[PDB]
């Protein structure tokens, strides 16, 4: 096993030992187990899945990057939420808002990227809230 700390700039969100950490890196999926090679990569706005034998906690990470050292694993995200602490009806308002604005924006409009980003943050929160 290896120790994981998922951290936002304000609080530590998940802490513990873990058999494996599934994280969607920007170049493709990565499974960080104990003894992995020292590495730093930005992550996509996706879940991160953490396995502890039979248990699987799923965290809604956004705007984060992964740092593995031989001993431990740190993920430093702008946002990170556990399933039970995700507001489901707010994630649908976040989705509806940014989805209907996306429909009609030109593909290199000033804010296209920001609203695409905000849609994915809400899309991920809805998946992670279902893993509860």
């Amino acid at each position: 096993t290896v120790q994981v700390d998922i951290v936002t700039p304000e609080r530590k969100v998940f802490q513990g030992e873990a058999d494996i950490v599934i994280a969607r890196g920007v170049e493709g999926e990565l499974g960080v187990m104990a003894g992995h090679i020292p590495l730093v990569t930005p992550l996509k706005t996706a879940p991160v899945r953490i396995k502890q034998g039979d248990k699987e906690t799923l965290i809604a990470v956004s705007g984060g990057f992964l740092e593995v050292r031989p001993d431990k694993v740190n993920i430093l995200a702008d946002t990170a939420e556990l399933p039970e602490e995700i507001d489901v009806e707010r994630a649908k308002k976040a989705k509806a808002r940014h989805e209907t604005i996306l429909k009609r924006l030109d593909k290199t409009d000033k804010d296209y990227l920001r609203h695409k980003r905000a849609l994915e943050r809400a899309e991920v929160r809805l998946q992670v809230a279902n893993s509860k």
């Binding site: 700039p9 530590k12 590495l39 730093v40």
Partner: protein
């Protein structure tokens, strides 16, 4: 006359219960603001670690964000509170912004302002300053995401060349009694202070120049967030001590109001009786 003083004591006594409590709430929020800063400091130090590692293995290392230019225009971030009742907290920071703009710049064209907090933008807008972006209604003890859009667009303006220096005015926390207004440079960064960190061996995916392209803007971002949390601690210290004084001043006024109430109470009884007795002695 007791009709007034009954009600004036009532007012001051109710009001004092609220100032007394408000100091206690301000006290709570200063703790939460310093707690969350003790997470933000290591979060930002870790980013700094990875940045100092990538610089330590690039042979030629340079970035636009570490390269000082000729100052064609300047960008000013200004952190103020949304609510008042915080003594001269906003006055002091705004006077410093007013001073340093008078000494430096000879027209509105040379600088441009990002107003964090309502007191700040209200001041600047009233006096026709070049306020290019704003944010109000920041939560007490806030997450980084609430400062992010105004941080990103301010970094965006330096990342091209809309301006060639970004600077931040806020009240620096010291004690709950002391908060000094100060100015700090954000951009360009100084490699003297961004690279002093523990150098480590990492693999970089896709590569080291690519992760450095996300982390350096992500670091400047956190400086702005650190300044906001120091500025929030300073708000809640200033409010603690302003409502502290208002509580003490209320008790002081309650002494002199009690003294007047009881002169009046005593005089009513004294004077009423003399009248009753004067009437009775005109018949006896």
């Amino acid at each position: 006359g007791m009709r007034e003083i009954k009600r004036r004591i009532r007012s001051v006594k109710n009001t004092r219960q609220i100032t007394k409590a408000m100091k206690m709430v301000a006290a709570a929020k200063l703790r939460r603001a310093q707690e969350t800063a003790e997470n933000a400091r290591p979060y930002a130090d870790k980013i700094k670690e990875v940045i100092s590692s990538i610089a330590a293995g690039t042979k030629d290392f340079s970035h636009p964000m570490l390269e000082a230019r000729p100052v064609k225009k300047t960008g000013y971030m200004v952190i103020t509170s949304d609510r008042g009742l915080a003594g001269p907290y906003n006055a002091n920071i705004l006077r410093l912004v007013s001073k340093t703009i008078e000494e430096r710049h000879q027209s509105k064209d040379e600088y441009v302002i990002f107003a964090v907090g309502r007191k700040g933008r209200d001041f600047f807008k009233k006096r026709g300053y070049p306020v290019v972006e704003e944010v109000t209604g920041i939560s007490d003890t806030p997450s980084l995401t609430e400062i992010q859009d105004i941080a990103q667009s301010a970094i965006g303006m330096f990342a091209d060349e809309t301006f060639d220096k970004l600077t931040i005015f806020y009240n620096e926390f010291v004690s709950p009694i002391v908060q000094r207004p100060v100015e700090k440079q954000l951009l360009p960064l100084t490699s003297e202070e961004v690279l002093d960190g523990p150098v480590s061996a990492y693999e970089y995916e896709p590569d080291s120049e690519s992760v450095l392209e996300v982390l350096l803007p992500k670091y400047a971002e956190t400086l702005i967030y650190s300044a906001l949390l120091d500025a929030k601690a300073s708000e809640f210290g200033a409010r603690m001590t302003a409502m502290g004084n208002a509580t003490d001043n209320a008790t002081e006024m309650l002494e002199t109001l009690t003294l007047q109430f009881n002169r009046a109470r005593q005089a009513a009884i004294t004077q009423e009786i003399a009248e009753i007795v004067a009437g009775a002695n005109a018949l006896r």
